[PDB]
Amino acid sequence: SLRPKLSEEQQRIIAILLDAHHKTYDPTYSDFCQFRPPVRVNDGGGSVTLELSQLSMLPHLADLVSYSIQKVIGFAKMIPGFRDLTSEDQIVLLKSSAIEVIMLRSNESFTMDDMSWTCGNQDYKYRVSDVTKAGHSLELIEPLIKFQVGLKKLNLHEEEHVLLMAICIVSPDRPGVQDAALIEAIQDRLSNTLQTYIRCRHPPPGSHLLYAKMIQKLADLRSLNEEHSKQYRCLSFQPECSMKLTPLVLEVFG
Ligand SMILES: C=C1/C(=C\C=C2/CCC[C@@]3(C)[C@H]2CC[C@@H]3[C@]2(C)C[C@H](CC(C)(C)O)CO2)C[C@@H](O)C[C@@H]1O
Structure with missing residues (x-):
């Protein structure tokens, strides 16, 4: 019922997060041509044996994800309060949420026109088929696409989008966290900002x-995270796979 106005602090938090995102997410994807080139082998049959023997799209997607992890680290460092956490807790949160924030931020390039992540010309248009060419299976891809569509249909304001990513990163329920109380206090400040923003600035019936x-999407992300982890493990068993990845990716998912 009540619709309190955003406090000055809350307005500041939102401005800071919008700015952090604008500085760490290039909507033109102009750096993508710097990644190792995408390669698409003929795999109309979705052969797991062929996909693993080639992992043709892995170098490109690994670079894309590595690049994205770097951007997420930058974004996180700008989250109000994040710097108040110990270095040890900051790393725990980053490593545990990295893949989830990547899935969230990728919703910006995802399009329901053809269910793909469109980051430019045909070369930089990523479809389910490209993900399989990187060693992953439908067990992850299917729910990921469903997740993207579900998120798209929420029609989030950029303010809600950046707050959701911040809330995802600053979660007290991550294994290995030291000061869960502090992390929770920071998350609550962000959650309260989101709840307040939604109540006085988001028009109905949306x-x-x-x-x-939005909170349910965070739960969904935990499941996607676990499935990606299991599949990454399997993928890492492929001889010479490390060379197709990056040191940052090896560390975060290793
Ligand atoms: C990264 C970003 C973008 C898209 C995200 C995608 C499309 C390609 C496949 C990805 C990267 C998917 C999200 C997760 C999925 C995954 C399952 C991860 C996996 C990585 C690994 C092999 C190491 O396990 C390869 O496929 C583009 C832009 O919006 C920026 C955003 O930052």
């Missing part, structure tokens, strides 16, 4: 239980 739906 505001109906929007917060609950």
